[PDB]
Please model this.
Amino acid sequence: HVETFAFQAEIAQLMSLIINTFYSNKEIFLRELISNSSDALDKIRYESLTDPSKLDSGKELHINLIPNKQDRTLTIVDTGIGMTKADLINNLGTIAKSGTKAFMEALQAGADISMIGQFGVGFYSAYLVAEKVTVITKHNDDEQYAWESSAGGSFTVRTDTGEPMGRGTKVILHLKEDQTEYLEERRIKEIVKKHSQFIGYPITLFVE
Amino acid sequence: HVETFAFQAEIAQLMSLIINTFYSNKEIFLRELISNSSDALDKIRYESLTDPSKLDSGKELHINLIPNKQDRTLTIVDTGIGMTKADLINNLGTIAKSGTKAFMEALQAGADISMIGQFGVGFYSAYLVAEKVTVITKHNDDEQYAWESSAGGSFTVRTDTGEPMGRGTKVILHLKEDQTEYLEERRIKEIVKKHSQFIGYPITLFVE
Ligand SMILES: COC(=O)c1c(-c2ccno2)n[nH]c1C
Ligand SMILES: COC(=O)c1c(-c2ccno2)n[nH]c1C
Ligand SMILES: [Mg+2]
Ligand SMILES: [Mg+2]
Model:
């Protein structure tokens, strides 16, 4: 059964600015997501140093970029640390609140949207290119969840019955109609090269 | 009683390159250290969301830059999550090993030293400006430690009998003789402005 939650007003605010503002340099969504994955692989790797059994849900620490033209999706998968239900519903909301206010103040000082990751709310750049985002995630301590928002002030969470994923986070981008350049192999390659060349984990770009 | 440890060969290697290479843009040591603190405050803040008693060792999450001309030291203090003894001796060594190899490969491709933080070995940029580094640190789960290295292949760790610090990390830079510009108020201000303007925690610069 699906639970529907309201975003705190400040996150709603941020998701609308990202959606409504004219800002043509949308491609940074991809370095933000890949950074987010890089951060989650670091946390699982570190944890596993003092508790090797934390890697029983999978030994490989890696990033996969999967485009799907027929579904119009670009999916970013990592086998990072994952998100618990509390993360999805309470924790990330709390943190994103003060990063949003800083990111908000910064813009009314002449910062721009590409700097969104310095404020720990990188994830929301997904709304530059996606009309809907679905996040499948599995943490060691909790069940597998599906989270979802087309923005407009609310999100849902359900327990996920799909393919079990071991441990990590899949971020599925349902791309806006004018944004299908990010399904193209040479375009994704160009962005990873330009913005993500030094990520400490293999990034595999799947072909269609 | 003081325990002396050898750095793994790869870290020794990196500490010598940093020390021996001609590279005039030394001021980035400060953004790397302040980033490291920012990362440690984030981890304590997050932990405390699911366990408020983690903040009993101190509620304030903040960065202090303290210069001392008579001691020739610049100290960076945070009240972040801290380092356990295992961190100091085993854990950070393990992580710094593969970040060093990537940072090493990157340079023999025309990357430069300012990019050291993308490889998770930012901390070692301290050796651009300091002949000796001392790190006092307190984690919730362990005792207070003093760690220390003038490089040359070894470091020491002892339990620290000094002023108890609550929780966090003080990084004390014993500056090389030609590097005292970083004791000057207007110089530190210039670097924080230039490289660290958007840190999510108050950074207080102490005067002498
Ligand atoms: C994986 O998605 C996220 O990172 C996320 C966030 C988030 C990440 C950073 N700030 O918020 N909130 N809610 C979700 C599902
Ligand atoms: C606070 O000092 C450090 O961050 C550190 C490190 C370190 C940080 C990042 N890589 O290594 N190793 N050993 C020490 C004492
Ligand atoms: Mg919210
Ligand atoms: Mg070592």
